[PDB]
């Protein structure tokens, strides 16, 4: 258990991903939170992120200031260390990310990084004098204190960011730290998985748990989870004919095979219906939404009694309407956790690679990647060409090496638009920067097998300013 | 001169212009054409075109018997070659691809040693070379690839020179040249020289019309006639379709370099005349009339005019009397001959760019709102490409405005046989940086895409 204190950096929960990564549980609280809150979680360190406010600002988040006096161990990234010199009689002096190498890293908190340590350095203040004791353990070429330590080695701050990518030692450096703060490692895959085991029997009972499945690997390892505990169950998957092709054959193959109690609707009429004449995306969203509350519905009524509602619902989405007739109680499950975390599950719950390794799919499918009216001749182009875009990335192996891919038809007489994204943060995203003759490939395949498609374009948008999907 | 007899090869345009390259006049005839007007031009040398038929064909295309025995230095590519053979005592059978020349000996490949990659054709095939004939190339599969006559003065190859599968193709085209002993008499300042005498006395002291837009072409036809003494008239209709900044940089150079100009201010007209209208043909259709309107407009208003001067090139050959002074001429060959005649860099190596203008790179109606957009985008994707010393190295960029709140499509290819186009395949980074430039600079571009398809099977335009 180690306390992430949130003081407002993009990076927050970032850190709070990086303990997992590294075995430990981590909880995420705001900068501000009193001492009593803190301390009730029993955590076993802390570490104070860092923030987009000075700590000179009037409306900076502060800690409790007892929390520096509490044999805690600490580490103080950027605003955390600013506020570690500020407050135990250090000087600060006086918002922005650059590169930098530390042309000195010395002590127990950089034990093992040899060579150059780049660092992705925060710019706005500086601490210039560390507390009385404390000694300096890092600098850069233009700045002689970019890393601090108490002289019993049990609190650390930083200037730079050792949870980002631009910080490529940085798990190094976190690592070092856990084992420094003492902290024990008591968050492994078989732990969660017998733990959460353990709840799901408990919590269900003898009672029946009712649960949405899309095919994506949350939904999917939730539904095993469910079948491995031995809850009584039932998996419902709506099929509303908005999906790629062959994929609910392939989901409904896989999770009956590893004994899940599945129930597949079919309402691909029901949902095409519904989005006759429909352009507007948010428009599109919203009635796929109702389609499927009533869909799904009229399952949890044929098939009740149900007293357990099953979502995916994680950890990110924690730090962020059925009908009348039906009362659930809600089992979530994998709430504490990270998206990779379940897919660790997944493994050890034996889902295949094929289901465990692939692309998120939106609720909506592929209703949101075709540019205008949703009818069901453009989703049979689309279908085709999707295939074939998919298809060629697994044989050259590329289809791992991305985070999303896509395609988009626009009519216009077709053109088709090719959309890959890399990520390094899980916030941004970078058009991939792909071979150049894949894309080749991959145009004049289209074209070829799909005639209907006459030009294939590929996209050069970033995220930000744009978003990965196109509506 | 060196003549071209056509089979129908659709590299026989190509075959022309390498000779051109080579700094040899050429000309392209009918295969059948009779012995009289083939010789009627003088030709040094002849060479004899592929073609998508057989030898053995009934409708295959025949040339005149007379010619092999004409004297005259000949080469044969693939169904030429196979003419050769056939009409000479030679045994021709129904047998393209790249290949490795295993060998190669002779005058023809003088300078061609170590690897010789070729173009071949395998429609038919030579099994035996006339009598008396050597086979001085061979493939791994086929042991006739070329044959040379005993008085060297005619050749046959079973592969295409003509084309770049064919690196030293053009090294075998020289050494055929330097064979027959063609002289090299396709030098620009001979042929301006020319196109000045010839025109002056077409013209005479009458008044000369022709439309200016921009293009090399239309510039190069006005330098030559201002540079002649001829009377002319230069009308530059601005229909407001243009790049941005084109009119003030063409009006401002041509007539600093001497040309009688008349800008056209007929943006409006345009404007008006595309309301509502999508249809890519309609768009051009009525952006054909409409210049027509505002071009015969100025026509009636001065003058009056005896000639109409059209830069007509040589692939188009392939009230007024016109006067086509480039109708034998590529367009490389006019943008050299701007350079003859003072035209600068600006103005001279600019990329391609339509009649209609912005029109056709709007996927929908035209409103001046979207050209503006557009048209900044355009200067932004030119700039950058210009910066990087990659606009250049393309044949065509250009950008298409799409309403989603717009995509941007950018669109650039390069080509090696001015007849096929392949998406270019710029350096990524480089994309990233237009996009990226492109979106900031123009808030109602909120994405950028690139164009990963060739031609065929699409157009280089989008409409």
């Given at each position: 258990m180690v306390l992430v204190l949130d003081f407002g950096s993009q990076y927050t929960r970032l850190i709070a991903r990086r303990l997992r990564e590294l075995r430990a549980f981590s909880l995420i609280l705001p900068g501000d939170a009193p001492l009593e809150e803190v301390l009730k979680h029993r955590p076993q360190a802390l570490i104070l992120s860092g923030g987009p406010?000075?700590?000179?600002?009037?409306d900076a988040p502060r800690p409790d200031?007892?929390?520096?006096?509490?044999?805690l161990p600490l580490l103080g990234i950027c605003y955390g260390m600013q506020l570690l010199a500020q407050e135990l009689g250090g000087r600060v002096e006086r918002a922005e990310y650059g590169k930098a190498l530390l042309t000195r890293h010395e002590g127990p908190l950089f034990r093992g990084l040899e060579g150059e340590v780049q660092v992705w350095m925060s710019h706005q203040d500086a601490v210039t004098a560390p507390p009385p004791?404390?000694?300096?353990?890092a600098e850069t070429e233009e700045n002689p204190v970019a890393a601090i330590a108490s002289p019993d080695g049990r609190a650390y701050g930083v200037?730079?960011?050792?949870?980002?990518?631009?910080?490529?030692?940085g798990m190094q450096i976190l690592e070092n730290f856990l084992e420094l703060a003492g902290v024990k490692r008591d968050w492994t895959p078989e732990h969660v998985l017998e733990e959460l085991l353990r709840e799901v029997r408990e919590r269900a009972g003898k009672d029946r748990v009712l649960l949405a499945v899309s095919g994506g690997v949350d939904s999917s390892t939730l539904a095993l989870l469910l079948a491995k505990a031995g809850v009584d169950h039932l998996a419902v998957f709506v099929?509303?004919?908005?999906?790629?092709?062959?994929e609910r054959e392939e989901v409904e193959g896989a999770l009956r095979a590893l004994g899940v109690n599945l129930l597949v609707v079919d309402a691909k009429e029901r949902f095409l219906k519904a989005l006759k004449g429909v352009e507007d995306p948010e428009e599109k969203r919203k009635i796929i939404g109702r389609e499927f509350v009533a869909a799904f519905s009229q399952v949890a009524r044929e098939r009740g009694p149900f007293r357990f509602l099953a979502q995916g619902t994680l950890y990110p989405d924690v730090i962020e309407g059925l009908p009348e007739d039906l009362e659930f109680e809600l089992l979530e499950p994998?709430?504490?956790?990270?998206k990779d975390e379940v897919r660790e599950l997944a493994l050890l719950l034996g889902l295949p690679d094929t289901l465990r390794l692939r692309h998120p799919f939106p609720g909506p499918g592929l209703a949101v990647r075709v540019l205008g009216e949703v009818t069901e001749e453009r989703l049979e182009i689309l279908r085709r060409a999707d295939d074939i875009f998919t298809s060629l990335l697994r044989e050259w192996g590329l289809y791992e090496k991305v985070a999303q891919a896509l395609a988009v038809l626009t009519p216009v007489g077709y053109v088709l638009a090719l959309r890959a994204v890399t990520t390094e943060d899980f916030m941004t995203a970078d058009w991939a920067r792909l071979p150049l003759e894949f894309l080749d490939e991959a145009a004049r395949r289209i074209t070829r097998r799909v005639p209907e498609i006459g030009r294939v374009v590929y996209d050069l948008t970033s995220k930000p300013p744009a978003t990965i999907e196109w509506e």
């Open positions: 406010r000075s700590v000179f600002d009037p200031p007892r929390l520096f006096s509490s044999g004791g404390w000694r300096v353990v200037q730079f960011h050792p949870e980002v990518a631009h910080t490529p030692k099929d509303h004919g908005l999906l790629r092709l062959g994998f709430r504490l956790l990270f």
